[PDB]
Amino acid sequence: MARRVRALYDFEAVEDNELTFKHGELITVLDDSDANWWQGENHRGTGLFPSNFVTTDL
């Protein structure tokens, strides 16, 4: 199942395939098959983000 994580930092997408998010927001992890870049989903849409920008503690 897709798991939820919370953002530790702001991240603003630079490429079209990246997700934008803000500190404290929830992200759904859709695909963590890659170690450093995960596909997620939030209220803004979907896209890739750095795995080290989030935590499993909600």
């Binding site: 702001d10 630079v14 490429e15 450093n36 870049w37 750095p50 920008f53």
Partner: peptide, 9 residues
């Protein structure tokens, strides 16, 4: 903020 590296996406 942690450093980001896009070379490896």
């Amino acid at each position: 903020t942690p450093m980001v590296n896009r070379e490896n996406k």
